[PDB]
From a paper:
The key molecular interface that enables T-cells to sense these threats is mediated by the clonally expressed T cell receptor (TCR) that classically distinguishes between self and foreign peptides. The TCR governs T-cell specificity by discriminating between self and foreign peptides presented by MHC molecules. One key feature that is likely to facilitate this level of cross-reactivity is flexibility within the TCR complementarity-determining region loops (CDR loops) that form the antigen contact zone. The finger-like CDR loops of the TCR are thought to meld around specific pMHCs, sampling the peptide cargo, and enabling T-cell triggering by ligands with sufficient affinity/dwell-time.
We generated 12 structures of the F11 TCR, that recognizes a peptide from the influenza hemagglutinin protein (PKYVKQNTLKLAT) presented by HLA-DR*0101 (DR1-PKY), between 1.58 and 1.89 Å resolutions; 5 structures of the DR1-PKY specific HA1.7 TCR, between 2.31 and 2.98 Å resolution; and five structures of the 003 TCR, that recognizes an HIV-GAG-derived peptide (SLYNTVATL) presented by HLA-A*0201 (A2-SLY), between 1.26 and 1.37 Å resolution. Indeed, the CDR loops of the third TCR included in our study, the 003 TCR, were superimposable in all the structures solved. The 003 TCR structures, which exhibited practically identical CDR coordinates, were solved at an average resolution of 1.31 Å. Finally, none of the 003 TCR CDR loops, which were identical in each structure, made any potentially stabilizing crystal lattice contacts. However, we observed several CDR loop re-organizations between structures for the HA1.7 and F11 TCRs, while all structures of the 003 TCR were identical at the level of the Cα backbone. In order to determine the appropriate Ecut for TCRs, we performed rigidity analysis using the 003 TCR at cutoffs of −2 kcal/mol and −3 kcal/mol (data not shown). Analysis at a cutoff of −3 kcal/mol, but not −2 kcal/mol, demonstrated that the structure was largely flexible, with very few large rigid clusters. Although this analysis is an approximation and should be treated as such, the average maximal loop motion was slightly less (6.4 Å) for the 003 TCR compared to F11 (8.7 Å) and HA1.7 (9.0 Å), consistent with the structural data demonstrating greater rigidity in the 003 TCR. On average, the 003 TCR CDR loops moved slightly less compared to the F11 and HA1.7 TCR CDR loops, in line with the structural analysis.
Numbering used by the authors:
A (entry chain D): 2 to 205
B (entry chain E): 1 to 244
């Protein structure tokens, strides 16, 4: 009869903004409520544990309230950072059971200071039969879509940080081994900046 | 120094009907050990918790899921009569007291249950060298590594520059893409980028390696196909800088 609900399912925001993560539970007879983060391909990290007798806990930029009788907890994350990106899980400990919510998947986007959107062709590999195109250096407002073609593969924006240069950049990779494939067309199903640089012939 | 929660094995590939036994060692001083199953579709689900060698609490799984705890607090769980939907991350957590003290999780055992070990393939791995136009326009140079055609998703990708593992300037996709999204046994692909300065790429003494560890079949799994047995292995690709 315990049901734990978390909203939003997914949150994407600009770095620096405050965030609100909501948890609710139908059975108020809990011993503790606990918030965790989980990164891709890893286990969970405990962030806060709020005992049933406590109303809140704080650790750094994280503060969570517990309203036991209302069946609610809210996690507030101040001044979000890229390294906050994770899945955040709400769990409750009941008399003789333990229940986890389905999570909020948080992505905190960098503010790109100097966008320079471009689509480049990487060099042919002599030990691969794929052609590879790199869409890079675009602002974090850009959305990368899948191709119309089932044999063209496109991976979502990924942020890299060149720490010693004070520099971060988004990119998406597209590839295929079909012959009617070119970098000029690879991202045609996405809305890309009108000023995107297509070098001749890192494109077509 | 301290050891965290440890789990063994890290990865398993089984066929339907088989059985597995998984182990977890708690943090020293923790006596409560809990097991959970994490699947895409049902999220984290509680199996059972042990303290001082006895089961204290149990979830709703059927009796083919079982567990135990030894006198030193180490715990095993066992799954019999395995089915495709038992594929999951099996997570262990330890605590000083689960009623009032935080759960500390291990990194899990990744179990894949398949119909047919012929469905298992290692990755092919390739490095693609940077675009000249990128170098001219930005004074930076992005390498791409692609790991493709693998099943199951039991891979770990890393970059190494002159023998030292790098994280600065890297981004690896958080999840692989299914090459055939509609299929239970689709093979996967994964991409990663490493970006360096143009000056660094232009030195021919600089060596770049993309390494993919793939966790596959055991010595004891039978193999009767023509192609190479898809055992646990590293597949890598490399490049050297160049005046570019």
């Amino acid at each position: 009869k315990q049901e734990v609900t978390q909203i939003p399912a997914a949150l994407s925001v600009p770095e620096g903004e405050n965030l609100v993560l909501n948890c609710s539970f139908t059975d108020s007879a809990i011993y503790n409520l606990q918030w965790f983060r989980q990164d891709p391909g890893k286990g969970l990290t405990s962030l806060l544990l709020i005992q049933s007798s406590q109303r809140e806990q704080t650790s750094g930029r994280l503060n969570a309230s517990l309203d036991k009788s209302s069946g609610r907890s809210t996690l507030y994350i101040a001044a979000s950072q890229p390294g906050d990106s994770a899945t955040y899980l709400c769990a409750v400990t009941n008399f003789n059971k333990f229940y986890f919510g389905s999570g909020t998947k948080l992505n905190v986007k960098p503010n790109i200071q100097n966008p320079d959107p471009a689509v480049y062709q990487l060099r042919d590999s002599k030990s691969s039969d794929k052609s590879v195109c790199l869409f890079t250096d675009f602002d974090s407002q850009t959305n990368v879509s899948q191709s119309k073609d089932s044999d063209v593969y496109i991976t979502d924006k990924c942020v890299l940080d060149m720490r010693s240069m004070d520099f971060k950049s988004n990119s998406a990779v597209a590839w295929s081994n079909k012959s009617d494939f070119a970098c000029a067309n690879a991202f045609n199903n996405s809305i890309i900046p009108e000023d995107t640089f297509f070098p001749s012939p890192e494109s077509s | 120094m301290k050891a965290g929660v440890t789990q063994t094995p890290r990865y398993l590939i089984k066929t339907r009907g088989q059985q597995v036994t998984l182990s977890c060692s708690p943090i020293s001083g923790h006596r409560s050990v809990s097991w959970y199953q994490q699947t895409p579709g049902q999220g984290l689900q509680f199996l059972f918790e042990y303290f001082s060698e006895t089961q204290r609490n149990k979830g709703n799984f059927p009796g083919r899921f079982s567990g135990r705890q030894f006198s030193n607090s180490r715990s095993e769980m066992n799954v019999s009569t395995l089915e495709l939907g038992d594929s999951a991350l099996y997570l262990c957590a330890s605590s000083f007291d689960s009623g009032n003290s935080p759960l500390h999780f291990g990194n899990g055992t990744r179990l894949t249950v398949v119909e047919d070990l012929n469905k298992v393939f290692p990755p092919e791995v390739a490095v693609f060298e940077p675009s000249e136009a990128e170098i001219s326009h930005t004074q930076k140079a992005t390498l791409v590594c692609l790991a493709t055609g693998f099943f199951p998703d039991h891979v770990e990708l890393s970059w190494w520059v002159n023998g030292k593992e790098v994280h600065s300037g890297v981004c690896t996709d958080p999840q692989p893409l299914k090459e055939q999204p509609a299929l239970n046994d689709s093979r996967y692909s994964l991409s990663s980028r490493l970006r360096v300065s143009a000056t660094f790429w232009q030195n021919p003494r600089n060596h770049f390696r993309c390494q993919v560890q793939f966790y596959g079949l055991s010595e004891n799994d039978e193999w009767t196909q023509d192609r190479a047995k898809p055992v646990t292995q590293i597949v890598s690709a490399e490049a050297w800088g160049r005046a570019d």
